[PDB]
Design an enzyme around this catalytic site. Structure first.
Site, PDB file in Angstrom:
ATOM      1  CG  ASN B   8      -1.765   1.198   1.406  1.00 26.81           C
ATOM      2  OD1 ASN B   8      -1.929   2.048   0.562  1.00 26.81           O
ATOM      3  ND2 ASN B   8      -2.343   1.275   2.609  1.00 26.81           N
ATOM      4  NE  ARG B  83      -6.352   0.433   1.077  1.00 23.69           N
ATOM      5  CZ  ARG B  83      -6.879   1.649   0.979  1.00 23.69           C
ATOM      6  NH1 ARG B  83      -6.270   2.603   0.228  1.00 23.69           N
ATOM      7  NH2 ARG B  83      -8.029   1.906   1.649  1.00 23.69           N
ATOM      8  CG  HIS B 172     -13.255   3.183   4.041  1.00 23.76           C
ATOM      9  ND1 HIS B 172     -13.911   4.316   4.496  1.00 23.76           N
ATOM     10  CD2 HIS B 172     -11.961   3.296   4.445  1.00 23.76           C
ATOM     11  CE1 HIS B 172     -13.047   5.070   5.153  1.00 23.76           C
ATOM     12  NE2 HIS B 172     -11.852   4.496   5.110  1.00 23.76           N
ATOM     13  NE  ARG B 233     -10.047  12.266   4.989  1.00 18.60           N
ATOM     14  CZ  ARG B 233     -10.082  10.964   4.761  1.00 18.60           C
ATOM     15  NH1 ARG B 233     -10.777  10.479   3.776  1.00 18.60           N
ATOM     16  NH2 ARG B 233      -9.359  10.147   5.531  1.00 18.60           N
ATOM     17  CD  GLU B 378      -8.825  -1.460   3.697  1.00 20.42           C
ATOM     18  OE1 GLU B 378      -9.159  -0.457   4.364  1.00 20.42           O
ATOM     19  OE2 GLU B 378      -8.401  -1.360   2.506  1.00 20.42           O
TER      20      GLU B 378
HETATM   21  N1  LIG Z   1      -9.197   2.575  22.168  1.00 22.65           N
HETATM   22  C1  LIG Z   1      -9.593   3.496  21.275  1.00 22.65           C
HETATM   23  N2  LIG Z   1     -10.644   4.310  21.567  1.00 22.65           N
HETATM   24  C2  LIG Z   1     -11.016   5.237  20.684  1.00 22.65           C
HETATM   25  N3  LIG Z   1     -10.428   5.376  19.473  1.00 22.65           N
HETATM   26  C3  LIG Z   1      -9.415   4.627  19.060  1.00 22.65           C
HETATM   27  C4  LIG Z   1      -8.905   3.605  19.944  1.00 22.65           C
HETATM   28  N4  LIG Z   1      -7.890   3.020  19.272  1.00 22.65           N
HETATM   29  C5  LIG Z   1      -7.750   3.609  18.067  1.00 22.65           C
HETATM   30  N5  LIG Z   1      -8.682   4.575  17.968  1.00 22.65           N
HETATM   31  C6  LIG Z   1      -8.906   5.532  16.896  1.00 22.65           C
HETATM   32  O1  LIG Z   1      -9.044   5.021  15.598  1.00 22.65           O
HETATM   33  C7  LIG Z   1      -8.626   6.079  14.733  1.00 22.65           C
HETATM   34  C8  LIG Z   1      -7.659   5.463  13.798  1.00 22.65           C
HETATM   35  O2  LIG Z   1      -8.385   4.443  13.182  1.00 22.65           O
HETATM   36  P1  LIG Z   1      -7.663   3.735  11.940  1.00 22.65           P
HETATM   37  O3  LIG Z   1      -6.490   2.933  12.477  1.00 22.65           O
HETATM   38  O4  LIG Z   1      -7.401   4.932  11.083  1.00 22.65           O
HETATM   39  O5  LIG Z   1      -8.650   2.777  11.053  1.00 22.65           O
HETATM   40  P2  LIG Z   1      -8.303   3.004   9.460  1.00 22.65           P
HETATM   41  O6  LIG Z   1      -9.486   2.743   8.585  1.00 22.65           O
HETATM   42  O7  LIG Z   1      -6.999   2.258   9.261  1.00 22.65           O
HETATM   43  N6  LIG Z   1      -8.079   4.604   8.743  1.00 22.65           N
HETATM   44  P3  LIG Z   1      -8.801   4.679   7.144  1.00 22.65           P
HETATM   45  O8  LIG Z   1      -8.156   3.511   6.446  1.00 22.65           O
HETATM   46  O9  LIG Z   1      -8.601   5.967   6.352  1.00 22.65           O
HETATM   47  O10 LIG Z   1     -10.240   4.443   7.471  1.00 22.65           O
HETATM   48  C9  LIG Z   1      -7.977   7.191  15.585  1.00 22.65           C
HETATM   49  O11 LIG Z   1      -8.893   8.229  15.974  1.00 22.65           O
HETATM   50  C10 LIG Z   1      -7.684   6.447  16.824  1.00 22.65           C
HETATM   51  O12 LIG Z   1      -7.568   7.345  17.938  1.00 22.65           O
END
Ligand SMILES: Nc1ncnc2c1ncn2[C@@H]1O[C@H](COP(=O)(O)OP(=O)(O)NP(=O)(O)O)[C@@H](O)[C@H]1O
Ligand SMILES: Nc1ncnc2c1ncn2[C@@H]1O[C@H](COP(=O)(O)OP(=O)(O)NP(=O)(O)O)[C@@H](O)[C@H]1O
Lengths: 394, 394
Positions: B8, B83, B172, B233, B378
């Site tokens: 990716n 990806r 997504h 965003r 993913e």
């Molecule tokens: N224990 C927790 N409580 C609340 N939020 C969390 C926790 N752990 C991770 N997060 C939140 O999850 C978000 C990050 O999520 P993420 O790892 O981006 O999923 P992601 O889909 O890989 N990103 P994207 O691919 O663009 O959707 C951040 O706001 C983190 O703070």
């Protein structure tokens, strides 16, 4: 036999109605149109179309006033109600117009510089023509001032809200309020324990969720462009798409503002008309883009209706209103069938009744939510607020 | 013991994973970060962070390749999965990469010029490094190519769609597809007679309605800015507001594109962080803007969930996934309580279980709709598509 004179000034026109204080029935209506165009004209129903030429807002209204003088109505005008588009955060209910109110209308006017300055011109003209008559301002945003911050904030930097007043305002407030009050009677609901969705579908279109009598979500935004796709208005559009289109065609944000307001929506998809009746006839003839315009319009209405329901503790009713909502048998049935997920059941024979049938239930017994058509009457709601205010010591 | 290498590439990085073809378990992961910055670096888990300096995408990947050579994995790499962000209307499913596929990726790339050119650089690097290894492209848009025109069209002039490819694409997709397939097993649903809403809540966030196995609505737009408010965003924003802000602050559409992508959402409202955990701790300490950011985020999620349900004949399940969806006890309960109108009932003790509990039901028996948390993967979905394609004669 006192009457209320109701004035609605746009950038090109002045619509008016004279309403009987007894019955809130319309006694006379009309339009000074082509305002600030070389050839302005006064048309009253039910009469022949007078011409006006080079006329400013005061001129047009003086002509209207002389039409009332003609008919011996001048001395019966006990109240004047003005439709104001945008009240910002300053106006949460209709008011008696004073110098303070005027100053506060001016202060919010930069939020809607087309509309509001015309509305203020109407006020200035009317105060000149009718100085011993109480006048009232009724704002198309005020009903929505009960939205909570979670519902009105955009996901923009706080500064845009706190310094510039960028937030959702919403419009059609006067309609959503009038129709929701009618709905408690028609549906026999307790206003204080109730959940409604109103769909005001006209050339402008918006949804409002009314929870225990108060607006808690609505589809238009800071401006009337957000939300439903409409006659010539885009409704919701990806800001990234818009930025991509700018960079790709060399259009400025100003070109795009025009496109999204005047060349979009039903007109933009169909390539044919903003008028739903032309598009329904076109689809009926085979026209594929008309059909797509209409399906798209329907799909966005359903999406907003269901999304607005999220702000309710319970969904009691869905109410159609506006030129489309009141008259389009087809658009109502397509929307309602797109909401089968909410347990709705249409009574098609009741849905087919024309709008001469006025306030009417169009859902069948097994429906989980009552569906209805309630004709809107913004003039009447304006008059009613004015009549209430006519009892006040200012 | 064949493996799949999953790549990716972003504009600043290359994330990768090596997956066992047997178990689709991760055997190694890493990141070449600070790409095309003066100081690029390679970090593998579970190892120490190597440095790279002036390295192009091919350089970084050669370094990654040498890390695999080190561990005697080179000859086990039977497949490479890439990806790709944007597949336009051209890609409706994952494909074996050939010269034709490459040309078609280039042709759609103007739709996402940041992301797609980095993805193509990864492809060029990998084809150079691994020329007798079959490679596959998996597109973040492809799952959504089942949306009907009523769901993908904007209310813009037809020409923008027909000549420029302006329409909703959604993102997504790989997550929404993986999670929806997992949901049919977890919820014991017939894929062909089913209605799901998936909420992928991460730093990027989107909703997808899956009807009988196919995406029928989704919240992101032509670009990933539309829909839910997210970490930095804006999500949905009134184009009139944006035009008003331009005229009022002297910002160009380009300034605004930056604001709405990088300075908005949870960061923009809170004034504090894009990170949900920082905001939850801040609210807990009294911070009012953190609380508003979070309530606003919640309210927009609920609004989109319910609105996406309109595209279903029946709502069987709502599934949370992504970093937030998987880990935020609080965000899930606030969303679910905002959806009482759909008859949802949360089992709070099941909601409190941490994500170590993996695929799990969080709704209580009386709930009208099953609520669940399904961890997204993913990489695994990418591997699976690659493994299927590894059986094909190309
Ligand atoms: N224990 C927790 N409580 C609340 N939020 C969390 C926790 N752990 C991770 N997060 C939140 O999850 C978000 C990050 O999520 P993420 O790892 O981006 O999923 P992601 O889909 O890989 N990103 P994207 O691919 O663009 O959707 C951040 O706001 C983190 O703070
Ligand atoms: N019989 C009909 N069938 C379908 N549409 C109709 C019919 N009659 C009127 N309309 C439509 O209603 C729309 C005009 O509605 P309108 O009179 O604008 O309500 P409105 O609210 O006054 N406008 P706005 O105030 O901005 O919401 C046009 O598309 C008309 O074609």
């Amino acid at each position: 036999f006192p009457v209320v004179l109701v004035i609605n000034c746009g950038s090109s026109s002045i619509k008016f109605s004279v309403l009987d204080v007894a019955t809130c029935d319309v006694l006379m209506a009309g339009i000074a149109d082509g305002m600030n165009t070389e050839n302005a004209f006064l048309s009253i129903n039910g009469d022949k179309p007078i011409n006006l030429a080079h006329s400013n807002y005061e001129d047009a209204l003086k002509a209207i006033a002389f039409e009332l003088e003609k008919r011996d109505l001048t001395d019966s005008v006990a109240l004047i109600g003005h439709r104001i588009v945008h009240g910002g955060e300053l106006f949460t209910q209709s008011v008696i117009i004073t110098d303070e109110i005027i100053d506060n209308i001016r202060r919010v006017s930069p939020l809607a510089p087309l509309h509001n300055y015309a509305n203020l011109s109407g006020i200035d003209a009317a105060r000149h023509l009718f100085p011993a008559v109480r006048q009232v301002a009724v704002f198309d945003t005020s009903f929505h001032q009960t939205l909570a911050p979670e519902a009105y904030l955009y996901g923009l930097p706080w500064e845009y809200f706190s310094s510039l007043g960028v937030r959702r305002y919403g419009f059609h407030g006067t309609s959503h309020r009038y129709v929701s009050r009618r709905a408690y009677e028609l549906l026999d609901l307790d206003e204080k324990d109730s959940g409604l969705i109103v769909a005001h579908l006209g050339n402008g279109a918006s949804i409002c969720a009314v929870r225990n009598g108060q607006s808690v979500d609505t589809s238009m935004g800071m401006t009337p462009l957000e939300g439903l796709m409409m006659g010539t208005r885009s409704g919701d559009v990806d800001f990234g798409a818009m930025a991509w289109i700018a960079k790709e065609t060399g259009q400025t944000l100003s070109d795009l503002e025009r496109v999204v307001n005047k060349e979009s929506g039903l007109l933009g998809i169909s390539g044919l008309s903003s008028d739903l009746r032309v598009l329904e006839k076109a689809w009926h003839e085979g026209h594929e883009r008309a059909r797509l315009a209409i399906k798209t319009f329907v799909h966005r209405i359903a999406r907003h209706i269901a999304g607005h329901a999220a702000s309710l503790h319970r969904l009691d009713g869905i109410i159609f209103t506006g030129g489309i909502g009141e008259n389009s048998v087809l658009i109502r049935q397509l929307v309602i069938e797109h909401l089968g997920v909410l347990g709705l059941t249409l009574d098609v024979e009741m849905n087919k009744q024309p709008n001469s049938h006025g306030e009417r239930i169009i859902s069948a017994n097994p429906s989980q939510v009552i569906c209805a058509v309630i004709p809107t009457n913004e003039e009447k709601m304006i008059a009613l607020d004015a009549i209430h205010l006519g009892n006040v010591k200012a």
